[PDB]
Symmetry: C2
Subunit: 266 residues, 2 copies
């Protein structure tokens, strides 16, 4: 009853066509939303780097340790930058890739749906029509047979002569679907198969696009990411306690020059 | 010259570095807390989006491998979020705590103001400078009185100026004497001054050595590539995607929804009842 082969149930295959277009929509929003998220994190990082760069500067921390601490603000700028690159790929490549695929792939016609949906719809309607008509008729038949046996019940007459003519109409219409069935089957097989081909393009494209996206997301492949931490670490390792102590000593402590009191005149 | 450490009072700056040290801990802790809040905001956002798209994709019409491959991206988002939630965690519960506890063992607020350790040095430096604060005011005294008798000498042009050439002798003698005494006692001043400053350097060193340790701690918590983990999540994604089979997905719709579906082709059926 639910089977493809019953009248009208080819519609699921048709519905699927409409679906693909919408599914391009869904994916495009998916990416945009993702990019928004990356954008927010890069943004919040630069704001932070900017806060702290300024607070370290203005503040009493001095020396190489001021610079080491400052370096973290340098990672936050770099990382921020990588996330903005992610956002820009997501948006400029992948979304535009999908936008383009959809545009060239579905055609709004007039009205009034996509052209690729209607072609399928018309193909199925044409493949199912003789058959659908035979199927209504075969239907009408059985009951007239289901109407001439049961009839024999009370009057049991032109009764065994009306079994013998509704039974043969029925039997003959039956014989005749038997005959139209393999064409009816060949014909469905074709529209359907043209539908698989279209859907296959879309799915093949999807798989490619997902991969594009994985790549634009994978910060941890890229050398730059691995490098910002190689570089942060060595900057901190650069800081010397003893260095800043000596610096304070000579610029602010006992190491400063003094003009020791002498004799004066005038 | 006059902003020298050696001038009276200028030991202040070494005493103030001590306080600065306390506030610098506080600055670092804010810096860290603030960083952490940012990491968690990204966590939540990813988590949110993953939840959103997991449902939209499920309730949506995409089926088969490509449903799974797509949905797999939500999975990365969850794990990346997990990772940034860990960063936040290390920042907050290890690094912010580490400094906070150090700060706690290092400075000791006194009931009525200041840190025990600031006053140590204020006192060291006062006491080391007191003898020389005197001499230095005495020297000022002599230098002044001296020029008195000296300038008093020269506004004039046995004779009249007998005293003007002698009192000079009286103070110049004293100025000269004090000047000697100063010189004679400068080394005890230096050695004492230097002694205190040395307690201060030792202190700051502790802080700086610790500061460095913590910054390194923070870097390790920040570094996502400290993580075969971070790489895993991308590997696992790519696998899930390359797993997608289009022709397999089409087969499934064929038998699920199309021609390969079962069918009771019409047969004869008797009256029965
Ligand atoms: Ca500074
Ligand atoms: Ca679905």
């Amino acid at each position: 009853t639910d089977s493809f082969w019953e009248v009208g149930n080819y519609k699921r295959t048709v519905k699927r066509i409409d679906d693909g277009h919408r599914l391009c929509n869904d994916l495009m929003n998916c990416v945009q939303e993702r990019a928004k998220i990356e954008k927010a994190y890069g943004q919040q990082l630069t704001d932070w780097a900017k806060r702290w760069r300024q607070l370290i500067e203005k503040g009493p921390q001095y020396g190489s340790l001021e610079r080491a601490w400052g370096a973290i603000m340098t990672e936050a700028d770099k990382v921020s930058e990588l996330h903005q690159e992610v956002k820009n790929n997501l948006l400029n490549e992948d979304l535009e890739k999908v936008k383009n695929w959809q545009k060239d792939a579905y055609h709004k016609q007039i009205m009034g749906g996509f052209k690729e949906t209607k072609e399928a719809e018309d193909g199925f309607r044409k493949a199912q029509k003789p058959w659908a008509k035979k199927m209504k008729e075969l239907e009408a038949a059985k009951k007239a047979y289901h109407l001439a046996c049961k009839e024999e019940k009370l009057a049991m007459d032109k009764c065994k002569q009306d079994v013998q003519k509704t039974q043969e109409k029925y039997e003959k219409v039956l014989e005749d679907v038997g005959k139209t069935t393999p064409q009816y089957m060949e014909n469905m097989e074709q529209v359907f198969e043209q539908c698989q081909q279209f859907e296959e393009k879309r799915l093949v494209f999807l798989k490619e696009v997902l991969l594009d996206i994985k790549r634009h997301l994978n910060l941890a492949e890229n050398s730059s990411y691995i490098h910002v931490y190689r570089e942060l670490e060595q900057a901190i390792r650069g800081a010397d306690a003893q260095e800043d102590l000596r610096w304070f000593r000579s610029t602010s402590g006992p190491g400063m020059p003094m003009n020791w009191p002498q004799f004066e005149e005038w």
